[model samples]
Target: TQSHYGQCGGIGYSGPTVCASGTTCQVLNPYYSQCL
Candidate 1:
């Protein structure tokens, strides 16, 4: 899972898409997303 400010999802991403407690996954671009 992703922690705060950690990569959570994105294009071609295949890792955990879940964020840590109190955080949410937000896409910042087509190639990167983060838990915030």
Candidate 2:
């Protein structure tokens, strides 16, 4: 898995929130999300 610091998923997202094997989706705002 790859950890990121940008937009991952949020809002109307209906997909897998798992960013990677060692990462997770983190919500930073209403429309801004990322893996951290």
Candidate 3:
């Protein structure tokens, strides 16, 4: 949830930063970062 929660790039305390549109947040830090 790349939210307006805690500034543009802030940690929301609940979890790590979320993905923006057309993407999903994962353990990895980048969009194309995925586990096999």
Candidate 4:
């Protein structure tokens, strides 16, 4: 079993300007991100 016990990403977004190369970011848990 895998646990999502890691906060590899950050919350609050700081707006869509927060981005990286070849990745997608979303509002997960309203306090975190769903990036891929």
- TM-score of predicted model 4? 0.35
Q: Write the per-residue lDDT of candidate 2 for residues 1-36, one digit (tens) a residue.
A: 334764567886655555876667788887767888
TM-scores for every predicted model: 0.82, 0.55, 0.24, 0.35
Q: Give the alpha-carbon lDDT of every model.
A: 0.89, 0.68, 0.37, 0.45
Q: On a 0 to 100 scale, what is the lDDT of residue 11 in model 1? A: 89
Considering every candidate listed, which one attains the maximal lDDT? 1
Judging by lDDT, tell me the better candidate of 1 and 2. 1
lDDT by residue (1-36, candidate 1, tens digit) is 988998898887888889999999999988699999
Model 2 alpha-carbon miss at residue 2, Å: 7.3
Cα deviation in Å at residue 17, candidate 4?
6.2
Instruction: RMSD for all candidates, in order, please.
Output: 0.8, 2.9, 8.5, 8.1
| Error in Å for residue 10 of model 1 | 0.8
lDDT of 4 by residue, 1-36 (tens): 111332224564344433455555544666776554
Candidate 3 — which pairs collide?
Answer: none
Task: Put the candidates in lDDT order, highest first.
Answer: 1, 2, 4, 3
The deviation in Å at residue 23 for candidate 1 is 0.5
* True-structure lDDT of candidate 2: 0.68
Q: Which candidate ranks first by TM-score, i.e. highest? A: 1
